[PDB]
Design a binder for these strands. Structure first.
Lengths: 256, 351, 254, 254
DNA sequence: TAAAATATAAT
DNA sequence: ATTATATTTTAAAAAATATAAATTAAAA
DNA sequence: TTTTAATTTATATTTTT
C-alpha cells in the first residue's frame, strides 16, 4: 500500500549510516503525511526523531498507516548496495513481511530489487513537547563532528557550557582537559560557517561523548547542526535537511 | 525454575532484550551473591588445584568477584550483593536432596582419584563445591572494603532481590535463575559477566512484558512456575512447559486445575504443597527494603591490600591497578536516563 | 635464460594482487609463446588460467618450457615493491632456481633487483576442454565488482539468470533477497558503459560468492569483464589484460 | 611563563606522529634556544634527537631551562585534535605540571585549550659527539620510506652500501633477497626527486629494518632524508624540518 | 543454578 | 508420528597476553 | 572512489595460585 520513489540514494544512505550503530533495530511509522521514526536507544539514553516529509519523496503514496520493524544493520547493509545517485523506491504491499528497496541507476541501465525481510517489533514512543530551548547553537556539521572526535580521545564525557561569549566544549580524562571554545560569528554568516547562538540563559551540562560520536555520523546529511539545550532538558542535535524533515538526536545529560 | 527461560525464549521473545554490558552506565542492580560465589568457585579452577593460597585458604571467589565488581563499576553498574541466609523449609528437603547428590558425587570420587583419571577429578572437584559461612564472611568483608553494599537476607535471597526491585530501590536483579521473575521482580538480569561482552550478552527479562504478552498476572505466573517445575515444591508429572502455558492460558488459578484434571491422565503428587509454595513465592520472609539504605563508599586502599593480598599472598600492582580503576570509575558523573525526562505517551507495534 | 620486460608493470602488480587470495602456491608455465598459469585454488573449487602472450612483452626471450614453483604471497609481496609506472623484468637462469624481478624506474633512477626462491611443487595442470558458451555477456567490470560486492552482504549464493532481455543476479539470504537486473546498453560498445549479450538459450545457475569476490579482486586488469556460462558448466570470468593476455576464472556451479 | 606560538603547527603534529611510536615517554628539554628532545628507544636501541629552534616559532618566550616529561602517546592524541593549519601556542607554568596547548583556527573562532599531565622523570644524557661523517646521502622522503617499507616485507635487516655510482639497500630473508640501487641525479630539483651523495670511503652497514620503519614516520616533515654514516658508527637519519629544526634518528648498526 | 541429547511417551 | 517430556549428562571466570582480523578514519 | 595504515576488536592462548 506504500510506495515512495525518492530520486537520490544519498539521503537514505546517510540516514542509515547515521542509524546503523547508535540503534540496532527500529520501527518506522509511515503515514500519508510522511515517514517518521521515533526510535529509542537500547542504552536508554538516546532518542532519534527522524522525519522525512511526504513532499520530500518525489513520488509518494500510502493508503493506510503502517509500522514496519526492521533491523537497521540489515537495512544499512542493503542500502549500502545503492550508489550515491541511485533512485530508491520503497515499496510495502498488503501483509507486509518484506520491504522492497528498488535502486534505479540514473543512466537507466541497472535496476536492483531487494526484498528485505521484516520482523515483529514493539518499540515504545516517547513524548516530545514543542518547547522553547535556553541555548540554541547552529554549527557547521563537520566542525561539530570534529569537536566530538577530538574530545573523544581526551575523556568519556563532555561539558558543554553556553554563554554570550560563545560555546565551550570541555573534556577531562587521563590525558588532561581540553576546552574547545567557539565564538558566534556574526560577521561571517554564510551557509557552511554559520555559528549562531540563540541565548536565553547560560547553561552548563555534562553529556556522554560516545553517544555524541554516534550522533555525529549524521554529518554528511546536512552542513548545519542545531544543538538545542535547556539547563536540565536533554539536548537536541538536529540535522535539518533542506529537502525533507529532520534527524533530531535527543541525549540525556549527566547529573552530579 | 526448570525451563522458564527456554519457555520465554520460545513463546514471548520480545520480553527478552539482548543488551550490552556497557550500555547502562549508572544502573542500580541487586546481585545474588551465592550464585556468583559458586561461579567463582567452579570456573576459576586451573585443573586439580583450587586456586587457593600457600596456606590452603580458598580465595578464588574473592579475586573473581573482585575483578567482576571492578568491571561493573567500570561499565557503570552499581551492584548490591544480596547474600543468602536461612532457606525456607520447603527447600530444606530439596537442598538436602541436592546435598545427597553431592554425596553421590562423593561416591563417584572413589572412581575419580583411585583410578587416576585427572579429567574426572577436575569434573567432580567442580561438583563438590559448597558455599560456607567462611566464604560468605570473607566476601562480605571484601565488599566492606570495596564499599559495595551487602545484604544478608533472612530468607532465600532471590526473593530479597525481587523485594529490592519491587521497592523501586534497584532497577534489576542479577540472579541468573528464573526464581526472581516468579518472586515478583519486574526486571531481571542474566549472564551479567565482565569479560564475555558478546559471547554471553546480557539477557534482560521484563516481567511486565511477560505478563502482557502471556495474558497473565502474578498469581497465575506463580502457578505457572509451580506446574512447569519449581524449586520449592514438586510439580505434576504429566505437565511440562508447553502444557503449562496451554493450561494456564485457558484456566487461571491452580484450584480449578487441581480439581478438573483427572488422576488417570495427569496424576497429582501424593504430597501436594502448592498452596504453601504459592505463599512462599507470593509473600516471602524478605527483609525490610526501606530499613536499609544503599550507600556506595570509596574503597579503602591499604586495608584492601592488607586483607586482599596480605594473607591471600597475591600480587600488588594488579590489585592496586584494579582499585585505582574502581576509584576512577566511581568518582564521576552519573549518567541520566531518558525515561526520566520524556514520558512514554504510547507504544508502537509493527503491524 | 628467461627474460621478460614489461613497461606497464602495474599490469603484473594487478595480476599478483588478483591471484593472491585464491592461489597460495602456483606453477607458472613459461614457454616461447609466453606466460601461462593453469592452477587450481587452495580449497579446490575454482580454476585459474592466466595467459600473457609474448607480443605484449616489450622484450621476451625464453628457451625451454620452464616450470616455476612460486609462492604467490611471496610474489605479491615482491611485486608490491614496484610502483604503478615501474618497468618489471622477469629473469631466470637455467642453473639457478630463483626468479629475479628487476624494477626500472620510469625516469630510470631507482633500479630494484629482487630475487625470489622457487619451491618444488606438484603439476596441477589437468587442462580444460573449451566450450561454445551459450550465455556470453561482455559487461563492465566495475559494475560486476559492485554486484558481487553488494550481493555478498546477503548470502553466499548468486543465481545468475541470463536471457535476451537482461541478466539477473539474485541472492537470497538470512537478511533479504537481492535482485540486480542489467539490460543491454546501446552506447556504441564503450569500454566502461557497455553490457553486450550474446545468446543461445536462457540459462540459470547458482554460484558461490567467496570465490566470486576472489574473482572481483581481478577487476583493475580490465574495465570490461566477460562472463560465459552454459548448461552445468563452470562459469568463465574472463579479464582481457590490455590486449596482451587474458585471465580466465572457472567456477564450478553450486 | 613559557610561550611557543607557531602559525602552522602541522610541523608539531608530524613530529608527534613521527616519534609517538618509538618512545612511550620522553623529556622535552625546553630552553631559550628552543626544544631539544634527546632520548632513546623504548627497547633502548635507537636514539631520537629532536631540535626545534626558536627562530621558526613565531612568538617564542622562555625564561627557565625546563625539562618536562611528556607522555608522547598522550601528546600525540592531544595533537590529533589540531588540524593541519592551526596556530599552535604551547603554554607552560613554572609551578604547575600542566602543558597547555592552544589551537587557533584560520577562521579565528575555534579556540582549543588542551592541558597535559606531565612527569618529572630524568633520563640520562647520552650526548653523542659530532664527527666528520664519511658517507652522506640526501634522498626524497617518499623514496626512502618506500625503500624501508618494501624491504621490510623481505627481512629484518638491510645492508646499505654507498659508492661513486650510488647507494644500494640490500635485504635478505626467507622471502628471498632484494637489491635497490639509486644513482645520483643530475640536479633535476633542489628538494623534489633528487638524490645527492657525498663520499669519503666505501663502506657497507647492516641495520635493523623495523627501527627504520619507525624512522620513516618522519617522512611528511621534510622532503629530504639525509642519511649519514661511516665505519662502525650509528646511522644518522636527518630531517631538516622546513629550515627551522632537525630530527635526527640514530641507529646502531648490527 | 543453567542447557542440551536422546530414549520415551501421549496427545 | 512429530510433538513434548522427562530422563541421562555436560556446564558456570577474568584477568593480559600476543596475534590475527574487520572495520573506520585518514590520505590520496 | 581506493587503498593503506593504523585502530581497535573479537578470538584464543596462558597463568590468576
Amino acid at each position: 500500500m506504500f510506495e515512495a520513489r525518492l530520486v537520490q540514494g544519498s539521503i537514505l544512505k546517510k540516514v542509515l549510516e547515521a542509524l546503523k550503530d547508535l540503534i540496532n533495530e527500529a520501527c518506522w511509522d509511515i503515514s500519508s503525511s510522511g515517514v517518521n521514526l521515533q526510535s529509542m536507544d537500547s542504552s536508554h539514553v538516546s532518542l532519534v526523531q527522524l522525519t522525512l516529509r511526504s513532499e520530500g519523496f518525489d513520488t509518494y503514496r500510502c493508503d493506510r498507516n503502517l509500522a514496519m520493524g526492521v533491523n537497521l544493520t540489515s537495512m544499512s547493509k542493503i542500502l549500502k548496495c545503492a550508489g550515491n545517485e541511485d533512485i530508491i523506491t520503497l515499496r510495502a504491499e498488503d501483509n507486509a513481511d518484506t520491504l522492497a528497496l528498488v535502486f534505479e541507476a540514473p543512466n537507466q541501465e541497472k535496476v536492483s530489487d531487494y526484498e528485505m525481510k521484516l520482523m515483529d517489533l514493539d518499540v515504545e514512543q516517547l513524548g516530545i513537547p514543542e518547547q522553547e530551548y535556553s541555548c540554541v547553537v547552529k554549527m557547521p556539521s563537520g566542525e561539530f563532528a570534529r569537536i566530538c572526535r577530538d574530545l573523544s580521545h581526551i575523556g568519556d564525557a563532555v561539558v558543554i557550557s553556553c554563554a554570550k561569549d560563545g560555546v565551550k566544549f570541555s573534556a577531562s580524562g587521563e590525558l588532561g582537559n581540553g576546552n574547545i571554545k567557539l565564538s558566534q560569528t556574526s560577521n561571517v554568516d554564510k551557509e557552511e560557517e554559520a555559528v549562531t547562538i540563540e541565548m536565553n540563559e547560560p547553561v552548563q551540562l555534562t553529556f556522554a561523548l560516545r553517544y555524541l560520536n554516534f550522533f555525529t555520523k549524521a554529518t554528511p546529511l546536512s552542513s548545519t547542526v542545531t544543538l538545542s539545550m535547556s539547563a536540565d532538558v536533554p539536548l537536541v542535535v538536529e540535522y535539518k535537511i533542506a529537502d525533507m524533515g529532520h534527524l533530531k538526536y535527543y541525549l540525556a545529560p549527566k547529573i552530579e | 525454575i526448570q525451563g522458564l527461560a527456554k519457555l520465554i525464549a520460545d513463546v514471548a521473545p520480545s520480553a527478552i532484550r539482548e543488551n550490552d554490558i556497557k550500555s547502562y552506565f549508572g544502573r542500580k542492580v541487586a546481585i545474588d551473591a551465592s550464585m556468583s560465589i559458586y561461579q567463582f568457585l567452579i570456573a576459576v579452577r586451573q585443573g586439580g588445584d583450587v586456586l587457593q593460597n600457600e596456606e590452603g585458604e580458598t580465595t578464588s571467589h574473592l579475586m573473581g568477584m573482585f575483578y567482576r565488581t571492578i568491571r561493573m563499576m567500570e561499565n557503570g553498574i552499581k551492584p548490591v550483593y544480596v547474600f543468602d541466609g536461612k532457606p525456607p523449609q520447603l527447600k530444606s528437603g530439596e537442598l538436602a536432596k541436592r546435598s545427597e547428590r553431592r554425596a553421590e558425587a562423593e561416591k563417584q570420587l572413589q572412581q575419580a582419584q583411585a583410578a587416576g583419571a585427572e579429567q574426572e577429578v577436575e569434573k567432580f572437584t567442580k561438583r563438590l563445591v559448597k558455599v560456607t559461612k567462611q566464604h560468605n564472611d570473607e566476601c562480605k568483608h571484601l565488599l566492606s572494603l570495596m564499599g559495595i553494599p551487602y545484604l544478608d537476607a533472612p530468607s532465600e535471597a532471590e526473593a530479597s532481590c525481587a523485594a529490592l526491585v519491587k521497592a523501586g530501590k534497584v532497577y534489576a536483579a542479577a540472579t541468573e535463575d528464573m526464581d526472581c521473575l516468579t518472586f515478583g521482580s519486574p526486571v531481571l538480569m542474566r549472564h551479567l559477566t565482565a569479560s564475555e561482552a558478546k559471547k554471553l550478552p546480557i539477557q534482560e527479562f521484563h516481567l511486565s512484558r511477560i505478563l502482557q504478552e502471556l495474558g497473565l498476572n502474578q498469581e497465575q505466573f506463580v502457578d505457572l512456575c509451580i506446574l512447569l517445575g519449581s524449586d520449592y515444591c514438586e510439580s505434576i508429572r504429566g505437565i511440562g512447559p508447553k502444557r503449562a502455558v496451554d493450561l494456564i492460558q485457558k484456566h487461571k488459578s491452580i484450584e480449578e486445575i487441581v480439581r478438573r484434571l483427572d488422576p488417570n491422565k495427569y496424576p497429582v503428587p501424593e504430597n501436594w504443597l502448592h498452596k504453601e509454595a504459592h505463599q512462599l513465592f507470593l509473600e516471602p520472609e524478605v527483609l525490610d527494603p526501606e530499613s536499609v539504605e544503599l550507600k556506595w563508599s570509596e574503597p579503602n586502599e591499604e586495608e584492601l591490600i592488607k586483607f586482599m593480598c596480605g594473607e591471600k599472598q597475591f600480587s600488588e600492582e594488579r590489585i592496586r591497578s584494579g582499585v585505582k580503576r574502581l576509584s576512577k570509575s566511581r568518582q564521576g558523573s552519573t549518567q541520566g536516563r531518558l525515561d526520566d525526562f520524556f514520558k512514554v505517551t504510547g507504544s508502537l507495534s509493527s503491524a
